[PDB]
Amino acid sequence: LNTKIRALQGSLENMSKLLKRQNDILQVVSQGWKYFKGNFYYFSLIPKTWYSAEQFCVSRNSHLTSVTSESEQEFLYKTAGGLIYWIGLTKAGMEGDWSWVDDTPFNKVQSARFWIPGEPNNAGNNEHCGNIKAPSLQAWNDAPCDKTFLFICKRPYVP
Amino acid sequence: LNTKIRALQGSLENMSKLLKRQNDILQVVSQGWKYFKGNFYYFSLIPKTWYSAEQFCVSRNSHLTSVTSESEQEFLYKTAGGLIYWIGLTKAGGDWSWVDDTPFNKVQSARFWIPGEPNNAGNNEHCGNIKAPSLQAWNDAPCDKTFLFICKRPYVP
Amino acid sequence: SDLEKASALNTKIRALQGSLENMSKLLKRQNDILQVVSQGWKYFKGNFYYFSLIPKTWYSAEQFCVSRNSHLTSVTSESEQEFLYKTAGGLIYWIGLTKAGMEGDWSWVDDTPFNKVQSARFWIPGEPNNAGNNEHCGNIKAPSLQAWNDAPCDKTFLFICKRPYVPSE
Ligand SMILES: [Ca+2]
Ligand SMILES: [Ca+2]
Ligand SMILES: [Ca+2]
């Protein structure tokens, strides 16, 4: 008999929770940032070298974006919209293994589908950073870290 | 009594629907798209020829935008903000038509052209773009010119 | 107790009514902001901003703003300065800074009072420098709180419009 009121309060409370999330996302997207599945992304307007871009991303409480899933890869290459963007792709260690600067473990197995066919070709033996280039799932290219490009920052949505 | 309870019930499910709808819009706008009156719009950062622009829209499950109302025309010219954008205008005969198969209204469209256009300059201007910062915004240009472009796709919850 | 059960139940129903109506109000605010943001504008703390895509002279930039029911943006706080320079993304944008000719004081085109004290820390070090006795306008230039440069008003830059969010209630 009273179970009705309890349930109303409940829907209202869940409604409240969703309004809170949308609001938080809106305040951020309102400031020229993008948003996708738990993360905020910034697509720069000015080109930088890989490291200056990273340094910039850090100054905005984020990192050059990592890619952790196929849906994220697809969001990135689609939002990139034909323009080329530095991402968190960079060689580290004494092995020249690829890595994410934000320290996401690099998924070798899954990443295979994310490279432009033929890349990374390490041209000139001087291509130790990665960018998003092609308008396809197979989007990544290795390029010299000192070349300037637009870049993409990423930081997690946190209540 | 129950009378006023199902009232709260109703208004509550109505907001839920309203909130869901705002989320749908937020999600797409969060991916760099625009929204206006039941349609999503994409104003590109990259310029392309008309043909390549359309392929680009198709690959995003949309089409170069049509224009169905002065209201839409105003949203488009304002948002273009002084830049030139390919839209879904193309010849087919040679009558003008919308690439998304929206029926082209000669009469309504008469008002949307820049004064003096379509001038078919060089006799090779078979595509349309938004150029002037006003309701009279469209110019016809050669399909091979490379301009920014605008995609359109319906909002569906 | 049957009397207390009635009281409680009622106060709770009145409460739900209060909240449901408040929520409706908050969805409307969400919708106001969303509609404008969905249209290429930005939003920050009670104000909408337009970061232009096309460059203009200072006077022509202001003119455009007026046509979109706004003005070249003023800077009223550190928080707004930071929002502006960070959102500028490294690009140069005209703002509402304007000097009354030679030896004139600096003012805001939207009539916001100019805080000579505060403003000191918003200029790039060394500005305003009036290079050429020509620079009667201000722009956001450097990616820092010390961001402002004075430049000749006939230079063409991208520009930033600003207008208050006034709820449609
Ligand atoms: Ca390469
Ligand atoms: Ca023409
Ligand atoms: Ca100066």
Side-chain angles (χ1 to χ4, degrees):
Chain A
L1 180 44
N2 185 27
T3 81
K4 236 157 297 185
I5 273 292
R6 316 166 203 173
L8 291 168
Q9 291 163 332
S11 308
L12 172 56
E13 286 166 3
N14 296 24
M15 266 193 52
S16 156
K17 284 192 172 196
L18 302 169
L19 176 53
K20 190 47 201 162
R21 184 180 185 90
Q22 303 186 21
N23 182 56
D24 285 348
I25 304 181
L26 184 55
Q27 304 289 3
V28 172
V29 163
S30 277
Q31 300 175 53
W33 282 63
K34 308 285 192 303
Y35 168 86
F36 181 84
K37 294 182 184 176
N39 290 289
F40 293 121
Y41 303 78
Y42 179 81
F43 293 64
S44 73
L45 305 177
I46 187 177
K48 287 179 185 297
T49 59
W50 187 93
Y51 184 67
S52 290
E54 166 63 0
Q55 246 178 346
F56 178 94
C57 286
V58 168
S59 72
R60 306 283 195 272
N61 192 38
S62 77
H63 288 281
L64 292 180
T65 189
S66 54
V67 191
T68 66
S69 63
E70 179 142 323
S71 62
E72 189 178 2
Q73 171 74 344
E74 175 177 330
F75 156 81
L76 291 173
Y77 91 74
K78 284 195 168 187
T79 304
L83 298 180
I84 306 178
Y85 293 85
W86 277 131
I87 65 187
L89 256 184
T90 191
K91 289 181 192 147
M94 309 184 58
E95 305 279 80
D97 284 319
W98 289 98
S99 63
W100 297 115
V101 60
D102 75 359
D103 283 338
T104 302
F106 185 74
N107 192 335
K108 224 131 171 284
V109 181
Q110 183 185 57
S111 288
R113 318 178 40 192
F114 299 159
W115 286 105
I116 299 175
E119 312 291 335
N121 62 353
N122 189 10
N125 274 76
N126 188 39
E127 302 203 317
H128 316 310
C129 288
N131 65 37
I132 288 176
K133 191 181 173 74
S136 156
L137 244 226
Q138 299 186 298
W140 302 348
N141 177 43
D142 60 341
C145 297
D146 304 314
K147 289 312 194 312
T148 66
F149 289 108
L150 301 175
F151 54 90
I152 294 164
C153 302
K154 173 199 204 169
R155 73 191 213 297
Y157 168 45
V158 51
Chain B
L1 208 59
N2 295 339
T3 59
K4 203 181 190 187
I5 252 296
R6 302 193 175 80
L8 295 184
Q9 182 180 353
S11 70
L12 197 46
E13 43 194 40
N14 284 348
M15 279 183 295
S16 155
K17 297 187 175 186
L18 176 47
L19 188 50
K20 174 205 302 184
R21 174 172 171 180
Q22 295 191 9
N23 189 58
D24 290 349
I25 292 172
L26 180 58
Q27 296 305 305
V28 176
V29 166
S30 292
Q31 299 171 15
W33 287 58
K34 312 286 193 286
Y35 170 81
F36 182 73
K37 290 192 174 188
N39 283 290
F40 289 121
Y41 294 88
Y42 182 80
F43 290 70
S44 76
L45 294 180
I46 200 182
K48 286 170 174 294
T49 71
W50 193 85
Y51 302 105
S52 289
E54 171 68 357
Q55 293 176 9
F56 178 107
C57 300
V58 171
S59 78
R60 311 285 220 260
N61 307 310
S62 70
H63 289 273
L64 276 170
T65 189
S66 58
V67 183
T68 58
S69 65
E70 170 176 320
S71 165
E72 182 169 21
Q73 175 76 348
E74 176 182 28
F75 160 76
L76 296 171
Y77 94 69
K78 294 260 180 170
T79 313
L83 303 181
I84 299 164
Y85 289 85
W86 279 133
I87 63 180
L89 267 167
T90 193
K91 288 214 208 76
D95 293 312
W96 294 102
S97 68
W98 297 107
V99 69
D100 66 20
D101 293 332
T102 293
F104 184 82
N105 177 358
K106 307 178 108 297
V107 180
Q108 182 192 62
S109 298
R111 315 188 297 113
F112 292 156
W113 292 102
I114 291 169
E117 313 285 353
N119 66 347
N120 195 14
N123 218 84
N124 190 43
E125 299 199 323
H126 311 320
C127 294
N129 63 42
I130 283 192
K131 182 179 186 179
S134 112
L135 273 168
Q136 301 180 299
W138 307 344
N139 174 43
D140 63 332
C143 293
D144 65 89
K145 269 284 135 293
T146 71
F147 294 119
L148 296 173
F149 55 89
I150 305 158
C151 303
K152 180 208 216 170
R153 66 170 230 256
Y155 164 46
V156 52
Chain C
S1 168
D2 293 307
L3 191 57
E4 289 164 352
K5 293 176 193 173
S7 292
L9 172 66
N10 266 212
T11 68
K12 284 178 180 180
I13 279 180
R14 281 165 278 181
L16 285 182
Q17 286 186 117
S19 295
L20 250 50
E21 298 172 10
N22 175 59
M23 191 109 315
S24 184
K25 190 161 150 52
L26 302 171
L27 290 176
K28 280 179 173 61
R29 167 186 171 94
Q30 291 271 315
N31 201 51
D32 291 334
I33 295 169
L34 182 60
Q35 302 307 290
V36 171
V37 171
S38 293
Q39 297 176 356
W41 281 62
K42 274 153 257 299
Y43 174 80
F44 180 71
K45 297 187 170 180
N47 288 298
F48 298 110
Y49 299 78
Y50 184 70
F51 290 70
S52 76
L53 303 165
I54 184 183
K56 292 199 171 312
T57 61
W58 192 94
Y59 294 96
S60 188
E62 165 67 7
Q63 275 178 317
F64 173 87
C65 289
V66 171
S67 86
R68 310 288 227 257
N69 188 40
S70 34
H71 294 280
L72 281 174
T73 192
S74 53
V75 186
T76 61
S77 71
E78 281 214 351
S79 64
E80 181 175 38
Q81 179 76 342
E82 170 173 339
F83 159 75
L84 288 173
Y85 88 76
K86 283 184 170 172
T87 305
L91 305 194
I92 305 175
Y93 291 83
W94 280 129
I95 57 179
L97 279 178
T98 185
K99 190 189 200 291
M102 299 172 58
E103 288 180 10
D105 275 292
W106 282 97
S107 74
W108 294 111
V109 78
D110 74 7
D111 286 332
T112 294
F114 190 84
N115 187 359
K116 217 177 190 308
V117 176
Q118 176 195 56
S119 295
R121 65 192 188 181
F122 291 147
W123 291 99
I124 290 172
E127 313 297 322
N129 75 344
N130 204 22
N133 245 226
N134 198 11
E135 327 206 295
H136 299 330
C137 292
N139 63 37
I140 265 189
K141 180 176 177 191
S144 131
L145 279 168
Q146 307 213 278
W148 303 344
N149 175 44
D150 61 341
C153 299
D154 71 326
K155 280 292 218 303
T156 63
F157 295 107
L158 305 167
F159 54 86
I160 301 170
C161 301
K162 178 225 222 140
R163 66 170 184 94
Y165 163 42
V166 47
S168 70
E169 288 188 40

